[PDB]
Design an enzyme around this catalytic site. Structure first.
Site, PDB file in Angstrom:
ATOM      1  N   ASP A 125      -1.005  -5.941   8.904  1.00  0.00           N
ATOM      2  CA  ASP A 125      -2.051  -5.188   9.594  1.00  0.00           C
ATOM      3  C   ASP A 125      -2.144  -5.726  11.007  1.00  0.00           C
ATOM      4  OD1 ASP A 125      -2.833  -3.731   7.256  1.00  0.00           O
ATOM      5  OD2 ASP A 125      -4.348  -5.165   6.740  1.00  0.00           O
ATOM      6  N   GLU A 135       0.786  -1.223   0.000  1.00  0.00           N
ATOM      7  CA  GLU A 135       0.000   0.000   0.000  1.00  0.00           C
ATOM      8  C   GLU A 135       0.825   1.283   0.000  1.00  0.00           C
ATOM      9  OE1 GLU A 135      -2.666  -0.747   3.204  1.00  0.00           O
ATOM     10  OE2 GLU A 135      -3.592  -2.424   2.108  1.00  0.00           O
ATOM     11  N   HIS A 175      -0.400  -0.516  10.605  1.00  0.00           N
ATOM     12  CA  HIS A 175       0.661  -1.452  10.215  1.00  0.00           C
ATOM     13  C   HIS A 175       1.759  -1.678  11.232  1.00  0.00           C
ATOM     14  CE1 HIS A 175      -0.672  -0.615   5.827  1.00  0.00           C
ATOM     15  NE2 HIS A 175      -1.177  -1.775   6.208  1.00  0.00           N
TER      16      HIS A 175
HETATM   17  C1  LIG Z   1      -9.383  -4.968   1.982  1.00  0.00           C
HETATM   18  C2  LIG Z   1      -9.089  -3.687   2.740  1.00  0.00           C
HETATM   19  O1  LIG Z   1      -9.094  -2.598   1.820  1.00  0.00           O
HETATM   20  C3  LIG Z   1      -7.683  -3.749   3.278  1.00  0.00           C
HETATM   21  O2  LIG Z   1      -6.831  -3.779   2.130  1.00  0.00           O
HETATM   22  C4  LIG Z   1      -7.336  -2.517   4.112  1.00  0.00           C
HETATM   23  O3  LIG Z   1      -7.913  -2.580   5.416  1.00  0.00           O
HETATM   24  C5  LIG Z   1      -5.833  -2.366   4.309  1.00  0.00           C
HETATM   25  O4  LIG Z   1      -5.238  -3.621   4.687  1.00  0.00           O
HETATM   26  C6  LIG Z   1      -5.553  -1.309   5.369  1.00  0.00           C
HETATM   27  O5  LIG Z   1      -4.134  -1.261   5.547  1.00  0.00           O
HETATM   28 MN   LIG Z   2      -3.116  -2.916   5.348  1.00  0.00          MN
END
Ligand SMILES: C[C@H](O)[C@@H](O)[C@@H](O)[C@H](O)CO
Ligand SMILES: [Mn+2]
Ligand SMILES: C[C@H](O)[C@@H](O)[C@@H](O)[C@H](O)CO
Ligand SMILES: C[C@H](O)[C@@H](O)[C@@H](O)[C@H](O)CO
Ligand SMILES: [Mn+2]
Ligand SMILES: [Mn+2]
Lengths: 605, 605, 587
Positions: free
Chosen positions: B376, B352, B542
């Site tokens: 996460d 991300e 995270h």
């Molecule tokens: C499926 C979700 O969008 C998930 O990708 C998010 O919660 C993401 O992991 C947040 O860091």
């Molecule tokens: Mn995430």
């Protein structure tokens, strides 16, 4: 508010100053993805919002006894234009703070509230099916990266998706947050009124408008005390009201024993004249604070409007009280929840124009909707001094010593502790008071002539003894040069001494004034290692004393206002501050709090 | 690096980006007096230097498995011109930090290193015959008076003059210092590459170049994700490599069970096409980071050079993953220590584009030479919730509750915990990995089709379960507005739940993703009073998770970079910071650390 | 488009039995005149007249101030103007709102001390750190006079236009498409600046979103057909300068025309949303990103592969397309977000579209002589700048719109059909230069008419201080036809040109045209019709952005009154000190 036939506004109906109704804005945020995810979350999400609104609206009241009002975003918030529509509604809805709720992942900075001038809280559902928590932490990181403080509310125990109860632990946080946020919203845009200015060189009576403006969002008004004389000589008060008050006072207010030195004792004719005069002080003080539509009818339209004052003070000493009856009766009744007109919210009011004590009382008042004791912290009584002076060995809550709290003349009659819940002494919001309770308060109070070696002008003081064993919190704001306001907090209990001990200590002190005996809870830490240390660290001669243990509420409030807390005895696990406070440190919570308040600074600078 | 026939540089041999070889500069200082004293100390002094160089070079390795390199001053240092000759050698020797060693008194400011932009440590021999210690303290005072931070290394036990062993306590300090200093030297002058930019409004994905520049000495590169499409459509990747990878993937990568909703399930033809595509994502991501000399041969000379990236990130959501297969396979394999080309150092890589998680992983990586778990922090599991949901009463390390760490699709396969030392699960540097261990990792992983309600474009996620009972450290940098980066650290253990408990909790969450169950060590202090408090204080969604307990190493690293540590569970006696930190206070180490970082500020401002 | 209001607060002496009742009507009249002046003279970006609110009564004591504040709070008031003819009780009557500008107009008359109130209440503003502008007319007026004198109107309207610019920005977004373009500083987008100074949010999409919407039909097909047809009728393809083996076939050029049209549609949908998208079943995409301004990264990664952004950038900034005449969408090439905000400053102040350009060359008189034989005369005589964007520019930047036989850029609602026609006729669109833009597309080529007054503007971020503003008022130039063609052909004849000469003053960086360029803080400028420097200076001071460089005459500088307490001699330093101390509005 109606328009005058030629010029201004004038009050009609209630006063000119109403109590405000700040709203709490509730923002349900949702995952933006359609074609499945969003639609399946709409109902669970919007319910979270509804349940938060019902919790607050069904539990909390404004100072006027009305239920607190909530506003929900016009839709769930998954993308920025939905956030913008939310922000647009809140701007015209008088929203004083925000609660975001969600059961799922949503897009951080796209969905967050950007208002820098109000508190925010975020409640992420602790569920497994969607990353509710994960949004919680993400968006809080944005808040800290962008220096917009937000509270984090995360429940301890994983809940099922279909569950709609709010867990007790979440509720506690939601309501502490809401109580504190509402206090900020109620202070904002109101004023403090000075009657007179500096009293006997007292720090808090040198009123500092930067503090009101920057920290509280508040204005400062002032009148010279000559205003009282003008209104008395010119008939600028309600004469019909005056007659009913004189009658009620004759029936309900017991004049007390006169301790005056012989050649200083006033005639009964003089005492009666002084009774009329202090009744008028009350009416005029009350009128100056909040306005009076009757003043308009009597053709005093300028005066009818008042000074928009949520809190106020009377200098008194030295120049007024050297000449005219003193302000004890006025200060007493303003702070008491009734008079001849009936049961009533109090008007928060400082003796000696101690503006900082006034604000301390107002914090207490807005957090609780209960009236407030104003006191001098007169004496620390060690067990050894008590033993020497009286022969008695202190026990239970008094065992470690205690403080004599006793203002120089006036105090809320609610501070007798005569109102009762479940067999115990309390102070209540006005709408919960019973007729018997008012009667008990009057019955357990009397009004000694003022001591004319101090108050040559005369008047009557207020004398009762607060009932023992009531949980209370003593509170004081102080101004530190180069820093700003700092807040100290001491939770504890009122005491019942043995009767002989009480009368001995009382009679050596100032038995014509009101007494509360106070024991603070000791923790073995900081300034709460001993009762002596608590006094020795108290930063002014005054304190504000409320029914209840409201330390944690105050700590939350102080963080919203970015006022550091220099001293408190609240358990650490109760400390609840915006989540970014913890980026300033997790061990030394006191230093982190100073660093955070120092950096963010006051709301309205 | 060779010169192009007409214009630029192009890689030949290995990649364009090599791992750097920062040196540690060792400075033996000596008493200046000749005609006896100096000559008699030369040999003992220069040996101290040699023994420190051998300690470091024989124990520590660069990320490429080569032994760390040391440089000794051209002579002992007794007078300033000898210091100048030293400084001149170091300037051309790529020295990232300094260690001064001495058994005697030497002349303070005449002999000290003045480099403000690198760490220094001083080791004074604890001997009686000369004032080694005394120099130690003196020169450290100069360091603090001149605001050039230095570490102090003083052994507990008086040694004999003729002894040349380095005491264990000194060794620990020398190696902690060296590991941390090398991390700073390896980051400096490298880049972070953004592929895409902001992901779903996530804080760390709003990349802050001031932080990279000022704190880390690092550059920021970026490409829009269109670059992947361009390279795929135009054949800008190695087609021979592609064929070998497709074959290896067919043999070694087990496709996982498809949980997709019925109408969203892809055909087998589509799944095969998506496999080809994600293999190319990997090659292109890897090529963008470090360059590829094959790209030059195929006549794509501009692209062959790469982006000098020691660490990088892929935005993915929302715009890419809504359209194209997602980045799970790419992110997984970049972070894994092998592929079709063989066993390999990892390429540190953020899901991300969480740049702050990337740097957290990179700290972890440079301190250990082990690959890094990206996760996460999905759920806190209290004992009560576990009992309710599963009937099981948690015990051993899980007894106080635990955290569910589970990234939204990808994770280093090394994070399975299948590599083994002494019967125990670990993650190893690539050069220590055995073929069996690679095989175990592949065997215990599968690759479920992506969930198309979130990742419409498709792809495959990564699914395994980290083995329990591995010592680990979870880590997170966060940016605090008006302060800068602050670092949090939680050492603890991966868990093995009972199998039923695992499957129950897993299946309610996201069973297509990778799982680590984490218990942090509690200390009864700060944010480590309970597992709940650790989550409630975690400053982002995270975390970065490394094998080992590296808290003390991180704390040392953070002080070199002047990043304050807001939260850690490392024992206090292990905290090892420049000696001037202690001039900022000895009791409140947290506040002193903020005051010190605040005042000195980042290295490269 | 929001409708921020101006709040008019009529303050009055609180004393009754005479004084107050006698002044009521004259006081209320000042409020009404100001409301009329503003509402009849200014308009929002959408053409509608600006809206004002008056306090629910005259303000003589604090509870009236409280009532005024209560009303303004729910009326979307973005700035205030207090008006009075008499003495009033300073801090009892003042507005305390710290997050919006304020102005006080005190009547210059003798019968009551209105100037006395004006100065007393501004003393409070300075002492309490709440900035306020002071508006005091030069000439004593008769008590019954009802004209607003010209010196007073000029100040009131300058104040209002600047105040409204802050009001329209607040709470909107800047949308990045892509990220950093070619290591260009302004395209490394700084959200703190947006958030702290402008009250704005930042949105972001990867350019992949374009490809996604194209592949999947996420745009309006009716609209596409009508656009393709309108573009064939109205848009003239230009000369292809590409070398032989890069020249594209007619088929390939035609496909690219379809693509760049779709780019335009998607860009616009992204900025403001589109309800047709919801009708076609993409309810999420329909809402847009709430962007008052945006940019497109373009190079390198997108333009290496796909048709470039020029068509989209050009038409977003132009006041028409196949859907008719229309407000522009302020839009930045290369996602240069600083240039974008510079354009938007100009846009919100003027309601006129905005030229984006690279400051390409300074031409000294000596070098024009050497290269062309020509000796520059007139406004060109002291040298000039070649302002020319790397492919796109608003078609209004042709200068084909006319007022009094003079070239201008107009707000969209004053545009005539024949003027749109002229803009189209004087533009062609050359294929993109494929050595720089392998992916193709078409650029925009025209020449801005000369003798048009303009202002060039740039916002730069200075580390550790924040945004700073630079302003150059000047004129466009017409060069001898053969001089123009020589300079053009050796630079980039496929792109759009404006020849610019800044007004020199012999002060500061305006001693010569070279100095102006030598002190220009970026490779980009935003260029507006009109001499609006004084308006920018006022707006800058509202937002606490120091002005590092401008050629506006000192008499026109109009700043909050407490600026003068930081110094009267050294205005630039006083400005930096004031901004430094006060800081951005939303810290
Ligand atoms: C499926 C979700 O969008 C998930 O990708 C998010 O919660 C993401 O992991 C947040 O860091
Ligand atoms: Mn995430
Ligand atoms: C009688 C004394 O003046 C008394 O009024 C003072 O001590 C006052 O209470 C101090 O706050
Ligand atoms: C063709 C070049 O990339 C051109 O686009 C650059 O000069 C760009 O204009 C910088 O603003
Ligand atoms: Mn007192
Ligand atoms: Mn350009």
């Amino acid at each position: 508010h109606h328009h005058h036939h030629s010029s201004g506004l004038v009050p009609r109906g209630a006063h000119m100053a109403m109590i405000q109704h700040p709203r709490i804005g509730i923002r349900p945020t949702i995952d933006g993805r359609r074609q499945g995810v969003r639609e399946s979350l709409e109902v669970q999400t919007m319910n979270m919002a509804k349940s938060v609104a019902d919790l607050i609206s069904s539990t909390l009241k404004y100072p006027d006894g009305e239920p607190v009002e909530c506003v929900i975003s016009p839709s769930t918030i998954g993308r920025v234009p939905e956030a913008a529509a939310s922000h647009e509604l809140f701007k015209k809805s008088n929203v004083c703070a925000t609660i975001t709720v969600t059961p799922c992942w949503c897009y951080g900075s796209e969905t967050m509230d950007m208002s820098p001038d109000i508190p925010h809280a975020i409640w992420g559902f602790n569920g497994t099916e969607r990353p509710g928590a994960v949004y919680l932490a993400a968006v809080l990181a944005s808040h800290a990266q962008k220096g917009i403080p937000a509270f984090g509310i995360y429940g301890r125990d994983v809940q099922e998706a279909s569950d709609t109860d709010i867990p007790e632990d979440v509720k506690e946080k939601l309501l502490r947050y809401a109580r504190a946020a509402l206090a900020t919203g109620l202070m904002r845009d109101t004023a403090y009124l000075s009657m007179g200015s500096v009293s006997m060189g007292i720090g808090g009576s040198i009123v500092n408008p930067d503090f009101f403006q920057e920290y509280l969002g508040m204005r400062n008004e002032s009148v010279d005390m000559t205003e009282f004389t003008r209104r008395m000589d010119r008939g600028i008060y309600d004469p019909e009201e005056f007659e009913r008050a004189l009658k009620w006072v004759k029936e309900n207010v017991k004049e007390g024993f006169d301790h005056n030195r012989e050649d200083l004792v006033l005639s009964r004719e003089e005492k009666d004249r002084q009774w009329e005069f202090v009744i008028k002080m009350f009416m005029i003080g009350r009128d100056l604070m909040v306005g009076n539509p009757r003043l308009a009818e009597l053709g005093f339209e300028e005066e009818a409007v008042g000074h928009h004052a949520l809190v106020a003070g009377f200098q008194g000493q030295r120049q007024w009280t050297d000449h005219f009856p003193n302000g004890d009766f006025m200060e007493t009744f303003l702070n008491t929840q009734f008079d001849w007109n009936g049961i009533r919210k109090p008007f928060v009011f400082a003796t000696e124009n101690d503006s900082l004590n006034g604000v301390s009382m107002l914090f207490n008042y807005l957090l609780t909707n209960t009236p407030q004791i104003f006191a001098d912290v007169r004496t620390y009584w060690s067990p050894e001094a008590v033993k020497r002076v009286t022969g008695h060995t202190l026990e239970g809550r008094a065992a470690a010593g205690f403080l004599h709290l006793i203002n120089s003349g006036s105090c809320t009659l609610d501070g007798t502790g005569q109102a009762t819940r479940d067999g115990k002494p309390i102070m209540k919001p006005f709408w919960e008071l019973e007729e018997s309770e008012v009667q008990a308060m009057l019955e357990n109070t009397d009004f000694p002539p003022a001591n004319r070696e101090y108050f040559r002008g005369g008047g009557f003081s207020t004398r009762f003894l607060t009932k023992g064993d009531m949980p209370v919190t003593m509170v004081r704001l102080n101004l530190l040069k180069g820093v700003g306001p700092v807040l100290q907090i001491a939770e504890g209990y009122t005491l019942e001494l043995p009767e002989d001990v009480h009368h001995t200590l009382d009679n050596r002190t100032d038995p014509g004034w009101p007494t509360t005996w106070f024991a603070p809870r000791l923790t073995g830490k900081g300034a709460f290692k001993s009762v002596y240390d608590v006094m020795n660290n108290w930063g002014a001669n005054h304190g504000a004393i409320t029914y209840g243990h409201i330390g944690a509420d105050l700590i939350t409030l102080a963080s919203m206002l970015r006022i550091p807390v220099n001293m408190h005895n609240v358990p650490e696990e109760d400390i609840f501050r915006p989540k970014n406070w913890s980026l300033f440190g997790t061990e030394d919570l006191e230093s982190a709090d100073y660093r955070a308040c120092q950096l963010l600074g006051p709301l309205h600078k």
